Design a binder for this molecule. Structure first.
Ligand SMILES: O=C(O)CCCC[C@@H]1SC[C@@H]2NC(=O)N[C@@H]21
Ligand SMILES: O=C(O)CCCC[C@@H]1SC[C@@H]2NC(=O)N[C@@H]21
Ligand SMILES: O=C(O)CCCC[C@@H]1SC[C@@H]2NC(=O)N[C@@H]21
Ligand SMILES: O=C(O)CCCC[C@@H]1SC[C@@H]2NC(=O)N[C@@H]21
Lengths: 113, 109, 116, 112
């Protein structure tokens, strides 16, 4: 498990907020950021559609150009962000309560490396 | 100003940590996340970002995310940073676990 | 439901054991935009050939000051409606036809997007 | 030195057109795609502002998630045709652009 920390937007309540979080990897020098929005899909299921940037560490500023990978992640419950979320890769995460400023913490387990 | 919340990687040394943060925009319903690395030789943050727009329908999700880069100049994340879009950021003390908060001002929309 | 647009690309391989990577550009005929797609063909759990791609959609901006916001990113998985040649479809409803691939790896085709 | 080709969009006859190209790397199995726009900058210089996706060949559909890198590339010496260079030390030359927006060129990468 690595800790995650982020926020969900609080501007309107007329939609399901966008959100972003950072996973602060505890087994490597990398960081990953996720950003997305929660939807009620056509079948009634909550879905988090996110995209992510995975930042690797480099030792030389001249290698900076190759340090960022990008991709998607769709999470389904195991539209409050709070709870447990799973993915098809087998990765999963837990999000705690969202407070009045829209902040939340959680934990992330990656099935893949 | 909009609040940012992130974490700096604390694994091993490292003189030049990676990091990530999320800016929760206070004038828009979107969210941006930045990730990158703090270099020192003079400190510079080289980041890439994803700007997530809010969409009304799950049908529109495909077009909701823009991407780009941002270099900030005046390795610790703590303190004041600027860039050449004219955007400014202030970052507070970093925790032993690596968590930080701050504020972000964007010069462009 | 859109106008068909041309696409042009190349595939790249050395070791026959892995399927080639490829990229292509779609030259949109109803907009000022350009999209590039890159990815690789796999055989699904299923059966099935799948093109797993990611894309960058470049909008036209008038002012270089607005360059920062001109690029969208996402994924697209295509399945036949592991050769690139033939007809491919996706979850949005978008459709793609790719012609024969030449000895240089070059290929062309047509793209119809069901979304804008 | 590696081959590229792509197309420029001329749907509005823009003096600052968008474009994209594929670079077919010759001594690897990777593919990079670039997309951007040609600008006349504030100081009169031509500048290509682009972003790229670099795709690695992976062995297994299960590693597909880690196969794509992203970043920017700004080229300076608005026509695409000619010689262009960047901060990394890389060099590109673009051929003639035909009536349909199509061009080919070569890309000498300085980094890997
Ligand atoms: O390898 C590292 O240094 C950290 C692990 C990165 C795991 C990535 S982050 C995006 C993708 N989605 C996942 O659930 N795991 C991978
Ligand atoms: O327009 C919005 O919805 C929020 C403002 C977005 C600001 C972006 S985030 C990436 C880029 N870097 C900046 O300093 N500002 C812009
Ligand atoms: O809107 C435009 O200017 C051109 C249409 C682009 C459609 C995009 S490209 C990425 C994604 N995949 C699709 O099949 N449609 C969208
Ligand atoms: O690594 C490979 O397998 C092929 C070389 C990749 C070169 C990349 S593409 C983006 C960036 N810009 C450059 O001029 N070189 C690198």
């Amino acid at each position: 498990e690595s800790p995650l920390h982020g926020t969900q937007n609080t501007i309107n309540k007329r939609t399901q907020p966008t959100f972003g979080f950072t996973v602060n990897w505890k087994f490597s020098e990398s960081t990953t950021v996720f950003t997305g929005q929660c939807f009620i899909d056509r079948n009634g299921k909550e879905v988090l559609k996110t995209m992510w940037l995975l930042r690797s560490s480099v030792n030389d500023i001249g290698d900076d150009w190759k340090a960022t990978r990008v991709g998607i992640m769709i999470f389904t419950r195991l539209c409050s962000l709070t709870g447990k979320w799973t993915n098809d890769l087998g990765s999963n995460m837990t999000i705690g309560a969202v407070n009045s400023r829209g902040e939340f913490t959680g934990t992330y387990i990656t099935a893949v490396t």
